[PDB]
Enzyme design. Structure first.
Site, mmCIF file in Angstrom:
data_model
loop_
_atom_site.group_PDB
_atom_site.id
_atom_site.type_symbol
_atom_site.label_atom_id
_atom_site.label_comp_id
_atom_site.label_asym_id
_atom_site.label_seq_id
_atom_site.Cartn_x
_atom_site.Cartn_y
_atom_site.Cartn_z
ATOM 1 N N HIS A 135 0.556 -17.139 9.371
ATOM 2 C CA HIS A 135 1.187 -18.473 9.360
ATOM 3 C C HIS A 135 0.356 -19.570 8.728
ATOM 4 C CE1 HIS A 135 4.313 -16.969 11.877
ATOM 5 N NE2 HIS A 135 3.517 -16.731 12.924
ATOM 6 N N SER A 191 9.638 -9.519 4.655
ATOM 7 C CA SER A 191 9.419 -9.762 6.075
ATOM 8 C C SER A 191 10.612 -9.351 6.902
ATOM 9 C CB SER A 191 9.143 -11.254 6.288
ATOM 10 O OG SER A 191 8.988 -11.615 7.654
ATOM 11 N N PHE A 192 10.376 -8.622 7.986
ATOM 12 C CA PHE A 192 11.388 -8.185 8.951
ATOM 13 C C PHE A 192 11.018 -8.960 10.193
ATOM 14 C CE2 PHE A 192 12.812 -4.585 6.440
ATOM 15 C CZ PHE A 192 11.713 -4.304 5.674
ATOM 16 N N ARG A 264 4.654 -9.929 25.482
ATOM 17 C CA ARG A 264 4.743 -11.179 26.232
ATOM 18 C C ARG A 264 5.534 -12.297 25.515
ATOM 19 N NH1 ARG A 264 -0.824 -14.324 28.078
ATOM 20 N NH2 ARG A 264 0.134 -16.023 29.285
#
Ligand SMILES: CCC(O)(O)CCCCC[C@H](NC(=O)C1CN(C)C1)c1[nH]c(-c2ccccc2)nc1C(N)=O
Ligand SMILES: [Ca+2]
Ligand SMILES: [Ca+2]
Ligand SMILES: [Zn+2]
Length: 368
Positions: A135, A191-192, A264
């Site tokens: 990111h 991207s998946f 999580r």
């Protein structure tokens, strides 16, 4: 056949701490290392300790001001940087922590060193579980990422490879990498990810690149609960078509483990075998490959996942019974390597998966 694997790891990486309540735990990299050591996977890999990447190496992508800030800020002087912290997005997701810059240097060092090793044709695969921080932007930290080690590793590969393919199986969209190369055809980003009321909010089916990069960004948006069967049915066909049309000479695969069942933060339902099938698919093309980490917030499952993916890279079979290790108690109550999917509903119907795959195939027909 069987390939040479170089693995990058610094024994200090597990000591970096994002802070109480922060889901990103660098200790999961040390759990992965210890588990793979106890399975005997060190006997077949060349293990290297990455160098600390310099501010200069980082500025091949990031701005000089952003890297200077990262190298200067500390918990004891934060009060004097409130202005730059806002400007560079340092806060809850990307906090200031002791040794932040050194953590970035080690994460980046492993990815760039792996890329150099692949460029020199000294290895078939290079692995850096501390990397994959997809990111981070040119002058901004985002989503637990400060320095985009992936972009830096790809810029290194671009010195010897005309076309580089980037594949990202983290549950979150690989926005920083997509943005860095959005207007070029020298990198294809695939991207998946989960899309819809989910961080970072980007990665629509319709985001396909711009200018010379038009058709060189591929996004497969998914809903909650995707399972091994569903993911497997689209991953191999899409990657095969991308290989056929794009013909890359090197590949970078981000193996974010937050796409596993029970994560999580994630809402997918893949098992370690389902996630690792992506590594098997990519490895089958016999191209220079850089395997990186990324997300993964149920740390016992991240260690299982990346240990199994390292065994896949080595073409080594390992037993389901976990060997004794420094973190054995974290793997209870079963003490097995493989995980079971949950009963969560898969909102990605077979028709939805086929329809999105067909739309991506239409875009792939537009390549030269
Ligand atoms: C390493 C690669 C990776 O793709 O896996 C990184 C994932 C990053 C997730 C970031 C997410 N942040 C956000 O949703 C913030 C709140 N919005 C205004 C933006 C977020 N931040 C936090 C968080 C929780 C506690 C303390 C600090 C951050 N949780 C979440 C969440 N559940 O999505
Ligand atoms: Ca992704
Ligand atoms: Ca591109
Ligand atoms: Zn993620």
């Amino acid at each position: 056949g069987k390939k040479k694997v170089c693995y990058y790891y610094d024994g200090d990486i597990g000591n970096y701490y994002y802070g109480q309540g922060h889901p990103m735990k660098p200790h999961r990299i040390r759990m992965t290392h210890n588990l793979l050591l106890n399975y005997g996977l060190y006997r077949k890999m060349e293990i290297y300790r990455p160098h600390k990447a310099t501010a200069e190496e980082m500025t091949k992508y990031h701005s000089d001001e952003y890297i200077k800030f990262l190298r200067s800020i500390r918990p004891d002087n934060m009060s004097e940087y409130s202005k730059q912290m806002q400007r560079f997005n340092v806060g809850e997701d990307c906090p200031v922590f002791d040794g932040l810059f050194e953590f970035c240097q080690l994460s980046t060092g492993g990815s760039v060193a792996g890329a150099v090793k692949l460029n020199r044709q000294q290895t078939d695969m290079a692995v850096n579980w501390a990397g994959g921080l997809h990111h981070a932007k040119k002058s901004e930290a985002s989503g637990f990422c400060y320095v985009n080690d992936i972009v830096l590793a790809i810029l290194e590969l671009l010195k010897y490879h005309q076309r580089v393919l980037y594949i990202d199986i983290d549950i979150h969209h690989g926005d920083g990498v997509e943005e860095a190369f959005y207007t070029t055809d020298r990198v294809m980003t695939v991207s998946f990810h989960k899309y819809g009321e989910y961080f970072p909010g980007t990665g629509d089916l319709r985001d396909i690149g711009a200018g010379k990069g038009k058709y060189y960004a591929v996004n497969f948006p998914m809903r909650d609960g995707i399972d091994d069967e569903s993911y497997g049915q689209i991953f191999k066909p899409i990657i095969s078509k991308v290989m056929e049309m794009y013909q890359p000479s090197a590949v970078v695969l981000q193996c974010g483990a937050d796409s596993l069942s029970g994560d999580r933060l994630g809402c997918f339902n893949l098992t370690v075998k389902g996630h690792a099938k992506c590594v098997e698919v990519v490895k089958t093309f016999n191209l220079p490959l850089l395997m990186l980490g990324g997300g993964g917030y149920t740390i016992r499952n991240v260690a299982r996942c990346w240990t199994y993916e390292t065994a896949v890279a080595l073409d080594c079979e390992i037993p389901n019974e976990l060997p004794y290790n420094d973190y054995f108690e974290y793997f209870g109550p079963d003490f097995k390597l493989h995980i079971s999917p949950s009963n969560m509903t898969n909102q990605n119907t077979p028709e939805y998966m086929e329809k999105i795959k067909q739309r991506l195939f239409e875009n792939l027909r537009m390549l030269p």
